[PDB]
RNA sequence: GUUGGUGUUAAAGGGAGAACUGCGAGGAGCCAACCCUAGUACGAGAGGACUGGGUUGGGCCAACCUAUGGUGUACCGGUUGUUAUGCCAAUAGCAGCGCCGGGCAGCUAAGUUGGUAUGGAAGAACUGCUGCUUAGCGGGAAAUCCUUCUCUAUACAAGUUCUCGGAACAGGUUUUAGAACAGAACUUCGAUAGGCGGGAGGUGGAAGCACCGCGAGGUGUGAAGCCAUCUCGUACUAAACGA
RNA sequence: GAUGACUCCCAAGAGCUCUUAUCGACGGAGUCGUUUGGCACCUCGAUGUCGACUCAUCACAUCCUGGGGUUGAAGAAGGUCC
RNA sequence: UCCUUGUCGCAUAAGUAGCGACCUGCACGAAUGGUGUAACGACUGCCCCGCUGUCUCCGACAUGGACCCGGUGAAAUUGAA
RNA sequence: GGCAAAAUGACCCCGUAACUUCGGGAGAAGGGGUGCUCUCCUAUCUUUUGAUUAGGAAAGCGGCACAUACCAGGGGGUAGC
């Protein structure tokens, strides 16, 4: 939803410049605003490690870039996330310092050796069941 | 929108080819199909009942404006088109009558509850 | 429109208060086509009975919806809990004659309204924000290829002398444009279901996409 | 042109307000406001 | 539970469309009507009372929103070029069975628009 | 136009949350055609009523995008020039979406709705009747004022009802609301946004593989392949809080 | 406020009969400040000038709609007037 | 060429314009040249064609400011209010 | 006042008016063709080995579209000077 005000070429060009650093990198530190949405080029890009196949990962080559993080996501992130259904990244807001009052952010990966907020264990997800709509709930007291 | 300004063909047998609107009796913006339009005939057969440069009346048959039935349908003919008139040179019982003999090119039946039941039954037929 | 509902000769009924769920397209038996809105009513209910003896004036007090304590602020919670009431989205009273007059903990829905008869609604609309003229209100606009600075804007209030720099009440470019508009006098309602308390209405009832509608005119 | 009296008036009401709640790393030194992440523990 | 009040809403409309589709694929017939066949049908029109008992033209485009769903036809009849819409799940359209297939590339087929 | 402070007896230091009432201010008041009553009154016909009801249209205004159009710049596909990933393969950058054909939700109107009222009072010339020569009242105009719609208790005679008192705030995730503020939703006995699964919804036959042909290329595997939005499951992420 | 527009006064004559439906000759009476103007009081150490676009607003001495009187108003179209 | 929108014709639904003609030239006129002329004009006028938001009637979308936070931080003008 | 905006544009071929100072108008106007694939012949080419690159024949093949993006004339009729 964000346009950070830049052309989306270049917007673009950034962003795959970023998720691909905190791919090399574990941790990164940014402006939050923006960490809210590298927040979701991570996770897609997380689920291509997590495929594996030849489409899924010609795909990945486009998305990702700079250096073999490709293959850095392909063997370890898939690895180490064979079982975590959705969510692949923490986003905390450390609002270190500027001097532009921007807001900071660390954001990096989960199940890692020192991770920020120690994590929750990965539990495969429940099977979907069918929706219904009784509106039944008084909630009276 | 058929408005002032427009040329459109004119599709019955009369004299006149093509006719030139200049206004549309009940509208502000132009008239959608099935509306009486105002307009100056631009050529014609040298011998037919019309000759160039003289305001006539005139009824759409055919225009590119997409109209919908109330069905929820709706139709958009290719190009405008118009059936002549005789103007109000003659008196009110006369209102809604025809010129020429028969026109050619398929029509819409919204003629009918626009009440020009009279072009209306000559139709080839009523799309 | 008379002799329905439940009341006497001649009163204004209580209304009732229910939810934009969009918009769909239905038929008639003649084979002709009406747009739709379905106004959900979730299950209101009576939670004041105002009074001219007590209070001052003549009002039901329904709510409408759901909550939980989690989500209500100590204040109406109390309200709530003295009236012995289950729990509703929002609030909303009406004045009503002295007949028509409800007890306290009477739940209402749409079999309350008897179909093919008429609706005033009133929905806080979708404001724009905060939008200028030529939309706000349906101004001009100078030429696109003569005239500079001002291709969007408008004009200049009357102005000399006299009238003494005393722009009237006009229309200037303003904030937004969410208030609550009624379309009186609707058209007929179609159908509204005795389970499901739904209603279908002709169409273009005021309102966001969910959350605000209020109906009233019988 | 114009004096202190408004001058005064327009700066006044936007003034510094202290702010709300404000919590410090109970040992990891920090002071912060609430939703930060100081620290670890 | 206890979702956003508008998602229940859009909820409510998904589910009150599929409602009716099947309320109508009760009684009715349709074909599949894929871009690029050859159409025929039927239509009763409320103005005139007439049923002209037959049109025909290859279908342009569809939008399958639901129970409205318009698909429109360029009928060359006896004129320049006719281009219909007609809603689907209509109460007018009855013999709406002869198809004649294609291979279209394109799916909304307005190129054969001039 | 949007807000923050403040005053308002009161009981808690007196702080609030809703819900009204509405002193009073605004807004809306259009017209035609056509049919009927009725070829009726009138007139020698020619011609052609009065009035009340009914329809069909234009304008004006308010609202809604479910459809149709227009757009839809982080979608799908076609496609040119060049540079790179050695090359094939499949992609990327750039050409101010590179250019095309499409395009949901959102927005808009060319689209759709909805209004152009009734009732009540006072009362214009104008009209009548009493009078008792001073006066009495009644009709009496798309006019005025009330009823509908909107706004409103800083309405200073400052109104009324319920309820909270660790109550209201504040902060964080959003928003059908939005310039900040504001409103509204959610704040872990949780669906607030993301993520992941399932559909819907858009594009329109993926790659690899197999075939047919020398090739351009075609056919099968295959409504395949993908995904900007929409719904639906799941707390996997970020919204408790020990100031 | 002269001219100006409007109203009003009178009423020869036209209106087949008829002064006043409709007008109305000569001659007067006033209202307004809109054409033409008169005066030169404010402004020349500045009061930006025609027309158009946008945006309106008031008066009513009313173009339609709205009511009534009257007519040389049979009806209908009008006329004139409130 | 004031009268002047002279007159008539062409052309347009309608052309104080444009073109052709009339001579009733306030006040054309033969090197301060008269009349005409193929080519040529970022020269004035008119007409037609194609093209189009110039328009009926405007709409959505892109970027940059406008809005908001942290910096740095002017400018005319200013009898006092 | 069609100001602006739009549109036309390139190469090859077809054909091209009034007028005339016979040089020109003339890129007059008005049309078609433009991709790639293999084959054949033609030229040509020493960059050796016989193929390669371009032209023009003629049969396919795909796309809505083949100067596909960038680049690139709006034209015609008639006055005055």
């Known amino acids: 939803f964000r346009k950070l005000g830049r052309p989306a070429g270049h917007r673009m060009s950034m962003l795959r410049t970023m998720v691909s650093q905190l791919v090399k990198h574990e941790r990164i530190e940014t402006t939050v605003t923006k960490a809210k949405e590298v927040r979701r080029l991570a996770d897609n890009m997380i689920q291509l490690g997590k495929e594996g196949s030849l489409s899924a990962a010609r795909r990945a080559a486009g998305f990702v870039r700079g250096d073999d993080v490709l293959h850095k996501i392909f063997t370890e992130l898939a690895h180490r996330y064979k079982d975590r259904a959705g969510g692949y990244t923490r986003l905390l807001r450390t609002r270190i310092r500027v001097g532009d009052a921007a807001p900071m952010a660390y954001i990096e990966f989960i199940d890692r050796e020192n991770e920020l907020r120690q994590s929750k264990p990965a539990t495969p997800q429940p099977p979907q069941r069918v929706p219904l709509d009784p509106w039944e709930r008084s909630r009276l007291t | 929108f058929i408005q002032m300004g427009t040329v459109l063909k004119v599709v019955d047998n009369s004299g006149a080819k093509k006719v030139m609107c200049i206004q549309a009796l009940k509208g502000k913006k132009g008239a959608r199909l099935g509306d009486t339009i105002v307009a100056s005939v631009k050529e014609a057969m040298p011998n037919g009942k019309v000759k160039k440069g003289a305001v006539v009346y005139g009824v759409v048959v055919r225009a590119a404006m997409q109209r919908g039935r109330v069905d929820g349908s709706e139709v958009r003919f290719d190009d405008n088109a118009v059936v002549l008139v005789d103007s109000k040179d003659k008196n009110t019982k006369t209102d809604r009558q025809p010129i020429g003999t028969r026109v050619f090119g398929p029509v819409p039946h919204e003629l009918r509850k626009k009440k020009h039941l009279k072009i209306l039954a000559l139709a080839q037929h009523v799309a | 429109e008379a002799k329905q509902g439940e009341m006497s000769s001649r009163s204004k009924r209580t209304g009732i208060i229910a939810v934009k769920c969009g918009m769909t397209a239905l038929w008639d038996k003649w084979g002709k086509r009406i747009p739709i809105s379905i106004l959900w009513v979730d299950d209101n209910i009576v939670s004041q009975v105002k009074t001219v003896e007590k209070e001052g004036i003549f009002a039901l007090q329904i709510g409408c919806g759901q909550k939980k304590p989690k989500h209500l602020s100590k204040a109406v919670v109390g309200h709530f809990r003295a009236q012995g009431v289950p729990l509703k989205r929002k609030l909303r009273e009406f004045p009503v004659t002295e007949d028509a007059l409800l007890p306290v903990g009477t739940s209402l829905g749409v079999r309350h309204f008897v179909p093919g008869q008429y609706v005033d609604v009133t929905g806080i609309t979708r404001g724009k924000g905060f939008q200028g003229c030529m939309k706000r209100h349906g101004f001009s606009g100078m030429p696109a290829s003569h005239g500079a600075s001002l291709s969007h804007r408008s004009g200049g209030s009357t102005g000399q002398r006299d009238a003494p720099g005393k722009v009237f009440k006009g229309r200037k470019m303003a904030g937004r444009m969410g208030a609550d508009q009624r379309t009186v006098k609707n058209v007929w309602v179609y159908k509204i279901d005795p389970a499901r308390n739904l209603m279908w209405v002709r169409g273009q009832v005021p309102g966001a996409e969910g959350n605000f509608v209020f109906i009233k005119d019988a | 042109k114009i004096s202190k009296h408004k001058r005064g008036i327009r700066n006044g009401p936007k003034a510094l307000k202290p702010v709300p709640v404000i919590i410090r790393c109970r040992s990891c030194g920090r002071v912060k406001l609430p939703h930060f992440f100081c620290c670890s523990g | ?114």
């Open chain 5, 1 to 114: 539970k206890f979702k956003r009040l508008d998602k229940t809403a859009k909820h409510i409309m998904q589910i009150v469309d599929k409602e009716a589709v099947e309320e109508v694929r009760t009684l009715r017939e349709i074909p599949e009507i894929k871009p690029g066949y050859i159409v025929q049908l039927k239509v009763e029109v409320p103005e005139n009372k007439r049923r002209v008992s037959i049109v025909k033209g290859v279908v342009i485009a569809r939008r399958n929103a639901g129970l409205n769903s318009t698909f429109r036809i360029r009928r060359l009849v006896a004129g320049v070029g006719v281009e219909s819409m007609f809603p689907l799940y209509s109460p007018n359209l009855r013999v709406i069975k002869v198809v004649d297939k294609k291979k279209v590339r394109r799916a909304k087929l307005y190129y054969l628009r001039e």
